[PDB]
DNA sequence: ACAGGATGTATATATGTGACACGTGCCTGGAGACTAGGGAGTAATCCCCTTGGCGGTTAAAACGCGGGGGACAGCGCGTACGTGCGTTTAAGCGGTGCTAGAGCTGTCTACGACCAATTGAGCGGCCTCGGCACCGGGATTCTCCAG
């Protein structure tokens, strides 16, 4: 529902959940901390610490 | 060819089992009045858990694939089992015809059952620590080509 809300307003994002693979997690991290277009980085609180 | 006797044969009638329905009597239910004890019905304790949602990590499943070696059918064929048959063996369907031996009735004890004591198993509660359970090798011993 957070993504459903962010879409209605038009906000780029790259979600992150425990179900994501560590490879995908690292790829998303590298693509977010490098690309300035993405405005949000939705993730879980108690994910990989 | 026929008129009547000399045998059959289903047909109809009075007599043998069985099983239901009835009719008496005598046990077994029913009816009643006491006296627990059992069980219901809260009211307290001690467990040790409780659930949702979610992130993480490792092995048990889950899946792919090859391939082999088994599961099936067909073929054949040779006992071998059913199918008649003629024989004969012995079940059995009624009988007679004793006797053990159930089944009972009665009698009368030893033998349980409470039962109130008495008390020592036995049960829980801790403590301890050998004994299995797992590591780590190191031999051995199967399995599988591969000749």
Swiss-Prot record:
Identification of the protein by name: Helicase SRCAP
Domain of life of the organism encoding this protein: Eukaryota
UniProt disease annotation: Floating-Harbor syndrome: A rare genetic disorder characterized by proportionate short stature, delayed bone age, delayed speech development, and typical facial features. The face is triangular with deep-set eyes, long eyelashes, bulbous nose, wide columella, short philtrum, and thin lips.
Family: Belongs to the SNF2/RAD54 helicase family. SWR1 subfamily.
Annotated S-S bridges: none
Subunit structure: Interacts with CREBBP and EP300. May be part of a complex containing SRCAP, CREBBP, CARM1 and GRIP1. Component of the chromatin-remodeling SRCAP complex composed of at least SRCAP, DMAP1, RUVBL1, RUVBL2, ACTL6A, YEATS4, VPS72, ACTR6 and ZNHIT1. Component of a NuA4-related complex which contains EP400, TRRAP/PAF400, SRCAP, BRD8/SMAP, EPC1, DMAP1/DNMAP1, RUVBL1/TIP49, RUVBL2, actin, ACTL6A/BAF53A, VPS72 and YEATS4/GAS41. (Microbial infection) Interacts with hepatitis C virus (HCV) NS5A.
Protein source organism: Homo sapiens (Human)
Subcellular localization: Nucleus
Function: Catalytic component of the SRCAP complex which mediates the ATP-dependent exchange of histone H2AZ/H2B dimers for nucleosomal H2A/H2B, leading to transcriptional regulation of selected genes by chromatin remodeling. Acts as a coactivator for CREB-mediated transcription, steroid receptor-mediated transcription, and Notch-mediated transcription.
Gene from which this protein is expressed: SRCAP
Complete-protein stretch covered: 2074 to 2122 of 3230
């Amino acid at each position: 529902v957070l993504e459903q809300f962010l879409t209605y307003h038009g906000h780029l994002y790259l979600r992150l959940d425990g179900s994501t693979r560590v490879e995908q997690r690292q790829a998303l991290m590298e693509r977010f901390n490098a690309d300035k277009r993405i405005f949000c980085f939705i993730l879980s609180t108690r994910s990989g610490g």
